[PDB]
UniProtKB/Swiss-Prot annotation:
SUPFAM superfamilies: FKBP-like (SSF54534)
Disulfide bond entries: none
Domain of life (superkingdom): Eukaryota
Pfam family, any one: FKBP_C
GO annotation terms (biological process): 'de novo' protein folding; calcium-mediated signaling; insulin secretion involved in cellular response to glucose stimulus; negative regulation of calcium-mediated signaling; negative regulation of heart rate; negative regulation of insulin secretion involved in cellular response to glucose stimulus; negative regulation of release of sequestered calcium ion into cytosol; neuronal action potential propagation
Reaction catalysed by this enzyme: [protein]-peptidylproline (omega=180) = [protein]-peptidylproline (omega=0)
Cellular component, GO, one term: cytoplasm
Subcellular location: Cytoplasm; Sarcoplasmic reticulum
Major subcellular site: cytoplasm
Protein name: Peptidyl-prolyl cis-trans isomerase FKBP1B
Species in which this protein is naturally found: Homo sapiens
Function: Has the potential to contribute to the immunosuppressive and toxic effects of FK506 and rapamycin. PPIases accelerate the folding of proteins. It catalyzes the cis-trans isomerization of proline imidic peptide bonds in oligopeptides.
Domain called PPIase FKBP-type: residue spans: 19-107
Chain's gene name: FKBP1B
Length: 107
């Protein structure tokens, strides 16, 4: 389950493909909670590739459903990233994660 609410401006066609190192200014958020992880804070806009399962499935499936310039809004289900496990100190178990994802990518 990936619920995408794209803020419209972009190009609508430059989709991430397999092995494409793509760039996302992500900004994390917890449902009824604050931020937990931000490439905007680091100003290091997370050059990641598609097809290696580096990112979680809630963040990976949201990337291919966007295009260049688009600004979507992830609502990541718990069971795809940390629902039973939970990260120690960052992500609790059974958290519905929120992301400000804008696909301003490369390749």
């Amino acid at each position: 389950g990936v619920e995408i609410e794209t803020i419209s401006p972009g190009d609508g066609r430059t989709f991430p493909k397999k092995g494409q190192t793509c760039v996302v200014h992500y900004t994390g958020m917890l449902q009824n909670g604050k931020k937990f992880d931000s490439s905007r804070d680091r100003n290091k806009p997370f050059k990641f590739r598609i097809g290696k399962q580096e990112v979680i499935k809630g963040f990976e499936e949201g990337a291919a459903q966007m295009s260049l310039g688009q600004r979507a809004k992830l609502t990541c289900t718990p069971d795809v990233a940390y629902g039973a496990t939970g990260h120690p100190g960052v992500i609790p178990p059974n958290a519905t994660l929120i992301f400000d994802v804008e696909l301003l990518n490369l390749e």
